[PDB]
Design an enzyme around this catalytic site. Structure first.
Site, short mmCIF file in Angstrom:
data_model
loop_
_atom_site.label_atom_id
_atom_site.label_comp_id
_atom_site.label_asym_id
_atom_site.label_seq_id
_atom_site.Cartn_x
_atom_site.Cartn_y
_atom_site.Cartn_z
N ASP A 1 4.10 16.52 -27.69
CA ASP A 1 5.28 15.99 -26.98
C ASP A 1 4.66 16.43 -26.08
O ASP A 1 4.26 17.90 -25.40
CB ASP A 1 6.18 17.13 -27.14
CG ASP A 1 7.47 16.49 -26.88
OD1 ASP A 1 7.25 15.54 -25.60
OD2 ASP A 1 8.40 17.38 -27.06
N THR B 1 9.63 11.59 -21.45
CA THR B 1 8.83 13.30 -21.32
C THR B 1 7.04 12.61 -20.62
O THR B 1 7.22 12.33 -19.52
CB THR B 1 8.60 13.74 -22.11
OG1 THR B 1 7.61 13.28 -23.04
CG2 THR B 1 10.04 14.99 -22.75
N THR B 2 6.52 11.76 -21.35
CA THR B 2 5.03 11.29 -21.05
C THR B 2 5.66 10.28 -20.80
O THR B 2 4.99 9.59 -19.10
CB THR B 2 4.40 11.56 -21.94
OG1 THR B 2 4.41 12.68 -23.20
CG2 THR B 2 2.92 10.65 -21.68
N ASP C 1 13.87 13.67 -31.69
CA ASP C 1 14.13 12.63 -30.68
C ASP C 1 14.43 11.27 -31.73
O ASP C 1 14.80 10.67 -30.98
CB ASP C 1 12.28 12.22 -30.38
CG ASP C 1 12.07 12.90 -29.08
OD1 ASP C 1 12.72 13.82 -28.89
OD2 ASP C 1 10.80 13.19 -29.53
#
Lengths: 484, 58, 518, 117, 506
Positions: free
Chosen positions: C44, C77-78, C383
């Site tokens: 993550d 996030t990424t 998530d």
């Protein structure tokens, strides 16, 4: 291997970006100060790269490309350097993605062949039989030169000279057969075609020389009239057999090659040749030796025994035109069926700076007309052909597959550097002008036509072809070693 | 080629395995023996070298 | 105005290049070392960016933005950081060409709004296709994130836990899920097969003295099970001044004895009238304090944190009694029962408090044989709960995994020729920036990024318009529509909005000012 | 100790110049002199090796090998050095982790070349 | 003269930071304070206050910005840019031999003639070609243009005008209107609240009660802690008796019951304090319909006193019955996974609250500050009836008149006034560069119609073009333009009058 290639690309990009500022008449000129103290100033890319003394081996290839650019198309020596550097700048990110240069090199050759057919479809088809577009092509090309009113007078002179030697399937025509002899005096309004031949010097100004002869033979002779050089009657006896062997072949025109070793014609031989009315023209340059052997169909004769009648040409009338500071000798009716008649025009003017730039201006005018001989049609400049190609490659890039699909996207982006530089050198905003050209592209296509600005298609075609093989050969060398 | 299909080869244009008899890409057999015989004699001397004696310049 | 625009692009690119290789299920992990000496390994990007302590003013925007992305979506996030770096790389080439930075910022906003309307025509409906196909998406939602871990063997058990948990905490009106209503608790030891779905707070308790029974009596058919929580410092008679209490001799044994116990006898009568079965306090209890409540079958609970009292009152509908005099039975909470159920071989002997009615909160129960397995399962479940909220809030969804970025690229690039002016090149750079994600997924999958991108564009034009993405993990074939792999549209829509918002804040700052350290 | 490195690794650098020049699509090399104006670009392997002065005393052995190949046929001279370079490149593993007599390795090539032909 | 040149670059360095922050579309600057708190704002006041520059002349530009923010509050960014621009124009004059004293003298005569031209350009208009409601609505759309809210600006103007009309037009302040950010939700669904609202940071238990529908709740301020819990101190009490171990846990619950009983006799339905309220009291208040909220900020508690007229009392003994207050209606919204508390229908309320909704917290922060620029235009419209045309209109004419008046003036003051007139071109420059427009093309095109005799021609901030701002509804008060020339000249005269800078360490 990338350390050798990336160092050469960055070194070549700095040279291409420096010449890029010199594009156009309003471009930034580059100064080069030689070690001897000579300083030259001009916007010509071929002159800058020649006197720069580049020590980079790959960067020296631009000199050979610029030499072939002026020899074939005759224009775009600066633009071909910009297009070469544009492909090298876009190739920096290609190596970072892991793309092998073979695909990069093979895609440039495949895109150059497809770009020609795109320009031909958008080009207007014209023929050489119509003199309307031929006269206006050479007239508008001289607007960059000091001559203005006299440019319209020299326009039909360059058109009629090319159409006779162009024929149909002859395609490329050697430009060495065109020699412009410049001399101080006279003016531009006085012009003579003289299709037979024109020499570079005057005739004998001494006493007894006829300087004019009708129905004479012209031939190349490397011999020289001199006294014995390992008493008056002894030297005249040696010169008697020399003029007697020439009379055997009935050669009334003697062309002696210029050499600082010995003299040309002795004063005693002038009285002998005056009775036979044999005209002699000395001070023949070494460059004219090969020129006279082509149009006249003669052969250079080293010795007196090699001199024969079969190697002599034919001249209907040889006379010396009377003019101020000129004295030009003309020859008409060489009567050579096999060889095409040469084109040599004498350039006259009062100032030395006139006949100089005038000779260079006529060279660019003959090349543009010669571009229509190989491939007919013309495309207006000013960024029109560069943007039109990128418009067609937008939808075509989606039809490809693999690594080559991304090259078509970057190939169209590198072509936009040429119209961008033209907008910067004019003071206008770079991006703002380019967007206005692509906005009207939905309606207008080639539209500059009302401004009388025309460009041949061979310049835009050769600029892509030469730059494609240039960058192709750059990536072929992955290492540099010392070999002596 | 390990199991059957001994005539297969690599295609440089398409970047895949194709039949060499259909494409018509062949190389001389005399060239194959000339390279192997030259490499066998050249490597025979080099592998036996335990020391290097520099030749005298002429 | 000179080196600021060039330095901000290279600084943000070097930071974003760290997590580019971890994108996707095949993305490689990283070894993070906490300052306390603990080594953590996870895929993550939120953990990696949060642990970064740096003085660079450009990279600070990635940490502040990632905090709000976990609550709203959690999968941005990424993906957003990599997409934000693509907009900065395309903007660097425009700076050298003389393009104004605000025009680049305003150009991305107009290009993003046009791409949203293009996906609205090509999106597909879930509930309109079938009702049970929607639940199948919830079962396989956590399977994708857990497919790279040992948990992927038991994934069928954890799939049914998130279906009933979201329905209770979320109402179809607002269609929103609160983070404070989800209690995430886990411990070391046991296995992952013992994880159960509980409708209420866990509240682990040893029932104090062992004589107390493990079950709560119904108390003569009483309604539910009533609890009483007290945050008051229930404690000896500590005055504000004197204190100083001591036993002189045996003569004071009977003098101070009957004077004390006679007090609590008045307050105990008010508790029996309300019917509170168990008493809960924040701090501990004495040894003899729970003995008199044992004969009345009234257990007591001690050592309970302040945050744990939130899930007790919401799930069981209980409250905290200010005073016993006016306390009534109307607002007292009622649950099914409270029993003790041992979990595995652990000697802690935890318990389970059920409800049987729909509550406003749930409690996630996660176990594992390793401390890392527990932490990796808690973050992956977070998530998974947010994807369920996005599927209910928006029925129209699109196929992601590389199929959405290619579709948005061809839509903006096609409309770029129709829009003239300066925005013509702003649409081209925005379309090329969207191609970074499918190329990154292609690079993260071990395939040619350019060779794969040219294939996805050819299948969506000459053949037919469809969604075909890049496979990071080995599958049977292409066309994920056959495998029923779906991604939330509003979840992907929130990512492209935060990406343009992050790209603007970077370009709008032309100056960097920071003091020194003393 | 350095004789094996110059005869093996040192011989690879000689073959690296003709390594990328093999094939019609192969790369090219540059031969530069002190004046740098006499240079040329060509893919010929026999010209590059003979033009570059070689200070490596072990590199002169491969020079006479190319001269014998040119007598037979003028094609494949580049492939001789490239194939010989691959045998010397793998000779490094034949020493460290192998420890096998070199003549026994050469005798193994004769048995392999017999089945290859 | 070496230190004077050093003071020139010190003013340009401070001016360069405020150049991108000039204008509504201008860029924002990032400054990292020693407290390690990220602060981003386009307001020049807060920017200069966080720098704390040790340089004496650079601090003068910071001190003059506080005077501009105190007496006025608008134009703190433009007053420093205009003051620092005179340092660059006077730089080449020092090397030529011209003393800075005659340069400072020419500014006093130039500003004196400029203030007279400001009153001539200010035209008082109220009811002419304008109505009462549409007057303030057209002013709010000026600052909201060229923004992400332009599509939703129709609903935002109605909430902005009602915020000003809800207060007395004699006394208005930007700090009296509260704004609370609501994460999540649609932007067009935001509503206006007449009373006061806070963030409601209380995360503890006691939910599902205290419904959003109240009739007439009583508001009472709180000082001390009502809960019996003692967080800090403690005591040690131990007995040796076996049966007494039960009774020694049973005591303290009776201690505060004496003071807590007086709270029930008051009947206050609203409990608010600057300290966190214990979870013990969260039940019985629901039986009496009493509402309680803990963890309330101290700044939000001051608005409660000005709303219902309450008072803060230390204990529960001396609390007077008339200190209570009530509203007309209560409302509580759960949007955003968080409960929000707000009061409605307070006739005595001296403050209001406007809630904002959006997709992200960073998006709302740009919407909140874009509204503050529109509030100052609406607030100063009713306060001052004299307005001047802005957006390049007034700035260009002040430089034009000084060119004609300098022709009749002889001596060094001619080139000095012309330098001050040329220094006025930096204001429209940065406005065009920050908005993306080319400042070179507009500078040449704007001077075309500017010489036709009309002084109202401005610069269009939406689409690049020259024209009049009267149709753009760009209005600026006259007090800002007058005080800007005086504050910039006074700050410039102090820097040029100091040749030698002396700093003693202590």
């Amino acid at each position: 291997p990338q350390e050798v290639r990336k160092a050469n690309i960055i070194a070549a990009r700095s040279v291409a970006d420096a010449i890029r500022t010199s594009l156009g008449p309003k471009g930034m000129d580059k100064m080069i100060k030689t070690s001897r103290g000579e300083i030259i100033i001009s916007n010509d890319g071929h002159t800058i790269l020649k006197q720069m003394a580049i020590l980079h081996p790959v960067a020296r290839m631009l000199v050979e490309v610029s030499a072939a650019q002026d020899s074939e198309a005759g224009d775009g020596t600066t633009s071909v350097v910009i297009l070469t550097g544009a492909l090298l700048g876009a190739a920096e990110r290609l190596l970072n993605k892991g793309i092998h240069p073979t695909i990069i090199a093979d895609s440039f050759q495949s895109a150059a062949k497809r770009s020609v057919d795109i320009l031909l479809e958008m080009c207007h088809k014209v023929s050489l039989s119509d003199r309307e577009q031929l006269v206006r092509a050479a007239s508008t090309s001289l607007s960059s030169k000091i001559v203005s009113q006299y440019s319209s007078f020299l326009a039909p002179l360059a058109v009629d000279s090319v159409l006779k030697i162009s024929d149909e399937n002859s395609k490329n025509v050697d430009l060495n057969d065109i020699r412009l002899v410049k001399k101080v005096g006279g003016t531009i309004d006085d012009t003579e075609m003289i299709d037979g031949v024109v020499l570079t010097q005057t005739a004998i100004k001494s006493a007894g020389g006829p300087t004019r002869k009708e129905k004479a033979k012209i031939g190349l002779i490397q011999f020289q009239i001199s006294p014995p050089k390992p008493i008056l009657k002894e030297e005249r006896a040696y010169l008697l057999n020399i003029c007697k062997k020439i009379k055997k072949a009935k050669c009334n025109v003697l062309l002696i090659q210029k050499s600082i070793l010995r003299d040309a014609v002795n004063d005693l031989a002038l009285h002998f040749l005056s009775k036979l009315n044999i005209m002699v023209v000395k001070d023949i340059e070494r460059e004219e030796i090969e020129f006279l052997s082509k149009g006249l169909g003669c052969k250079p004769i080293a010795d007196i025994e090699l001199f024969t009648e079969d190697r002599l040409g034919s001249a209907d009338l040889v006379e010396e035109i009377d003019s101020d500071g000129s004295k030009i000798v003309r020859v008409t009716g060489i009567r050579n069926n096999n060889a095409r008649p040469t084109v040599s025009v004498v350039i006259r003017g009062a100032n030395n700076m006139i006949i100089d730039e005038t000779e260079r201006s006529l060279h660019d005018a003959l090349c543009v007309i010669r571009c229509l001989v190989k491939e007919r049609g013309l495309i207006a400049g000013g960024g029109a052909p560069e943007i039109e190609i990128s418009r067609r490659l937008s939808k075509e890039a989606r039809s490809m597959e693999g690594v080559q699909a991304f090259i078509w996207q970057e190939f169209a982006s590198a072509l936009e550097v040429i119209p961008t530089t033209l907008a910067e050198n004019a003071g206008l905003n770079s991006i703002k002008v380019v967007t206005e050209l692509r906005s009207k592209h939905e309606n207008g296509e080639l539209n500059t036509y009302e401004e009388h600005i025309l460009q041949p298609v061979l310049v835009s075609t050769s600029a892509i072809t030469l730059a494609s093989e240039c960058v192709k050969s750059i990536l072929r060398i992955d290492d540099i070693a010392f070999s002596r | 080629i390990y199991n059957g299909i001994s005539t297969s080869g690599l295609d440089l244009n398409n970047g895949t395995i194709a039949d060499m008899r259909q494409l018509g890409i062949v190389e001389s057999y005399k060239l194959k023996r000339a390279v192997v015989s030259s490499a066998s004699e050249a490597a025979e001397v080099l592998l036996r070298v335990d020391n290097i004696i520099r030749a005298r310049p002429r | 105005g000179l080196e600021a625009k060039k330095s901000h692009i290279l600084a943000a690119r070097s930071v974003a290049s760290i997590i580019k290789t971890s994108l996707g299920p095949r993305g490689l992990d990283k070894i993070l070392i906490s300052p306390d000496g603990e080594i953590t390994i996870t895929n993550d990007g939120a953990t990696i960016l949060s642990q970064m302590e740096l003085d660079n003013e450009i990279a600070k925007l990635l940490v502040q933005l990632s905090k709000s992305q976990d609550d709203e979506i959690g999968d941005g996030t990424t993906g957003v950081v990599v997409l934000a770096s693509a907009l900065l790389d395309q903007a660097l080439e425009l700076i050298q060409k003389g393009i104004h930075p605000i025009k680049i910022a305003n150009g991305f906003d107009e290009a993003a709004k046009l791409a949203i309307s293009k996906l609205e025509e090509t999106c597909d409906d879930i509930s309109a296709s079938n009702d049970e196909l929607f639940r199948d998406f919830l079962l396989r939602a956590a399977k994708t994130s857990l497919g790279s871990k040992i948990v992927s063997k038991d994934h069928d058990r954890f799939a049914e836990m998130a279906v009933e948990a979201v329905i209770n905490v979320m109402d179809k009106d607002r269609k929103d899920v609160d983070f404070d209503l989800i209690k995430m608790q886990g411990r070391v030891g046991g296995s992952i097969s013992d994880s159960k779905l509980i409708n209420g707070v866990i509240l682990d308790k040893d029932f104090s003295h062992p004589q107390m029974p493990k079950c709560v009596l119904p108390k003569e058919g009483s309604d539910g099970v009533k609890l009483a929580i007290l945050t008051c410092p229930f404690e000896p008679p500590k005055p504000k001044t004197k204190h100083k209490l001591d036993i002189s001799s045996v003569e004071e044994y009977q003098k101070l004895q009957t004077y004390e116990q006679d007090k609590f006898k008045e307050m105990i009568d008010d508790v029996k009238k309300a019917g509170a079965d168990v008493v809960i306090c924040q701090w501990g209890f004495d040894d003899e304090a729970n003995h008199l409540l044992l004969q009345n079958d009234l257990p007591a609970v001690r050592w309970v944190g302040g945050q744990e009292l939130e899930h007790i009152a919401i799930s069981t509908n209980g409250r905290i009694v200010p005073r016993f005099q006016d306390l009534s039975k109307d607002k007292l909470g009622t649950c099914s029962r409270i029993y003790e159920q041992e979990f595995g071989t652990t000697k802690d002997r935890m318990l389970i408090i059920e409800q049987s009615k729909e509550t406003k909160t749930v409690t996630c129960f996660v176990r594992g044989s390793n401390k890392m397995i527990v932490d990796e399962a808690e973050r992956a479940l977070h998530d998974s709960l947010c994807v369920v909220r996005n599927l209910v809030k928006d029925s129209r969804v699109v196929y992601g995994g590389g199929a959405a970025e290619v579709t948005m690229s061809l839509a903006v690039s096609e409309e770029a020729d129709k829009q003239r002016g300066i925005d013509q090149y702003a649409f081209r750079g925005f379309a090329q920036a969207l191609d970074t994600i499918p190329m990154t997924l292609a690079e993260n999958s071990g395939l040619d990024p350019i060779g794969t991108l040219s294939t996805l564009k050819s299948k969506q034009l000459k053949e037919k318009i469809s969604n075909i993405g890049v496979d990071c993990l080995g599958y049977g074939s292409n066309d994920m529509k056959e495998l029923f792999v779906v991604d939330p549209f509003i979840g992907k829509k929130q990512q492209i909005l935060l990406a343009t918002q992050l790209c603007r804040m970077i370009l709008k700052i032309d100056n960097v000012i920071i003091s020194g350290k003393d | 100790e350095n004789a094996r490195l110059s005869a093996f690794v040192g011989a690879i650098a000689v073959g690296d110049l003709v390594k990328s020049t093999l094939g019609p699509k192969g790369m090219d090399k540059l031969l530069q002199s002190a004046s740098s104006n006499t240079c040329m670009v060509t893919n010929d392997g026999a010209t590059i090796l003979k033009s570059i002065p070689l200070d490596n005393p072990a590199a002169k052995v491969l020079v006479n090998i190319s001269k014998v190949q040119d007598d037979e046929v003028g094609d494949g001279t580049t492939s001789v050095t490239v194939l010989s370079a691959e045998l010397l490149r793998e000779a490094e593993k034949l020493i460290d982790q192998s420890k096998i007599h070199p003549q026994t390795i050469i005798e193994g090539y004769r048995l392999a070349s017999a089945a290859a032909l | 003269k070496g230190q004077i040149i050093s003071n020139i670059n010190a003013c340009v360095a401070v001016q360069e930071a405020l150049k991108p922050t000039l204008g509504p579309l201008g860029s924002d600057i990032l400054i990292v304070t020693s407290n390690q708190k990220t602060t981003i704002s386009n307001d020049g006041a807060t920017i200069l206050k966080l720098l704390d520059v040790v340089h004496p002349a650079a601090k003068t530009l910071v001190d003059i910005s506080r005077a501009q923010d105190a007496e006025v509050g608008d134009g703190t960014t433009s007053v420093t840019i205009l003051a620092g621009e005179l340092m660059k124009e006077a730089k080449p004059f020092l090397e030529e031999g011209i003393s800075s004293h005659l340069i400072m003298k020419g500014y006093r005569k130039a500003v004196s003639l400029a203030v007279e031209k400001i009153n001539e350009l200010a035209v008082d208009i109220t009811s002419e070609k304008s109505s009462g409601r549409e007057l303030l609505e057209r002013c709010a759309r000026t600052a909201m243009s060229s923004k992400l809210i332009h599509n939703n600006a129709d609903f935002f103007v109605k909430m902005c005008v009602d915020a000003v009309l809800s207060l007395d037009r004699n006394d208005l302040d930007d700090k009296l209107i509260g704004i609370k950010k609501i994460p999540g939700g649609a932007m067009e669904e935001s509503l206006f609240i007449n009373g006061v609202a806070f963030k409601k940071t209380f995360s503890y238990a006691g939910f599902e009660q205290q419904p959003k529908k109240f009739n007439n709740p009583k508001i009472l301020s709180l000082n001390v802690e009502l809960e019996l819990k003692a967080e800090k101190d403690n005591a040690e009490v131990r007995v040796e008796h076996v049966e007494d171990y039960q009774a020694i846990v049973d005591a303290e619950w009776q201690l505060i019951f004496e003071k807590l009983r007086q709270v029930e006799e008051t009947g206050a339905n609203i409990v608010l304090s600057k300290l966190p309220i214990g979870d013990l009291a969260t039940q019985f208040f629901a039986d009496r319909n009493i509402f309680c909220a803990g963890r309330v900020s101290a700044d939000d508690m001051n608005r409660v006193i000005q709303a219902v007229g309450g008072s803060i009392q230390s204990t529960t003994s001396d609390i007077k019955p008339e200190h209570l207050g009530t509203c007309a209606l209560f409302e509580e919204m759960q949007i955003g996974s968080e409960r929000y508390n707000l009061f409605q229908g307070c006739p005595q309320a001296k403050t209001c609250t406007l809630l904002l909704r959006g997709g992200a917290e960073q998006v709302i922060a740009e919407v909140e500050r874009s509204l503050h620029d529109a509030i100052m235009i609406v607030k100063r419209a009713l306060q001052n009836k004299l307005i001047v045309a802005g957006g390049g209109a007034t700035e260009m004419e002040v430089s034009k008149c000084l060119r004609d008046y300098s022709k009749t003036i002889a001596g060094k003051q001619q080139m000095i006034i012309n330098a001050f007139a040329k220094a006025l071109e930096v204001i429209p420059r940065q406005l065009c560069e920050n908005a993306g427009f080319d400042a070179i093309e507009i500078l040449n095109k704007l001077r075309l119609a500017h010489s036709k005799g009309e002084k109202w021609y401005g610069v269009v901030f939406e689409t690049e073009n020259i024209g009049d701002n009267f149709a753009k509804f760009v209005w600026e008060p006259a007090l800002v333009k007058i005080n800007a020339l005086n504050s910039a000249t006074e700050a410039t005269n102090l820097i040029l009058s100091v040749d030698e800078t002396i700093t003693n360490k202590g």
